[PDB]
Design a protein around this nucleic acid. Sequence first.
DNA 1: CCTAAGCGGCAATCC
DNA 2: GGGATTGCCGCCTAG
Length: 165
Amino acid sequence: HLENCLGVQKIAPEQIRQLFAQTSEYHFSIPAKTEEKSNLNVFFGEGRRDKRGFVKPRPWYEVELIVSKDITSQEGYPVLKSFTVITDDGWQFQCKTSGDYSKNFRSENDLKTLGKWIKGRLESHGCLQNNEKITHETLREYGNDHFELRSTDNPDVWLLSFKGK
DNA sequence: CCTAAGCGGCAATCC
DNA sequence: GGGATTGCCGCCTAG
């Protein structure tokens, strides 16, 4: 679902096999929270309100990963930085950490990009359907409730995993 | 001047 | 009370 998305590139399988074969100096297990108006479920939160008073609904694939201080404060974590992310299923796009405490982990220049990777993967495995809330059952049915954020010898390129079963 | 969403931070919550 | 945390809302500014 990410092939035709602007800013997203395809990384060859053999290029992936080598990258993930390296051991990371920094590794993080970012929890997939089940918050209902934030995180994976930003779609169910309030829309964006204009000065006229209209509230425009969020796109279905708009998501964020809010990372706690317990992981943010850890050494090596990209605080308020932009970086390249290479996914375990062979996709590359830009991400940027932002907000207070640099808690907000999002795809860069298109919030939907990270959403299409996460929700798309959930949908593809049949654990989620359009306009449905992501719950503990969704993650249990998928087979994983954490994202793996790993460092690479290049300080501006990270590895990101969300394998199921 | 509008338009729009990227992402910066308001504010609800806890102790 | 208000420092700490972050779930959630919408300001801000590029184009």
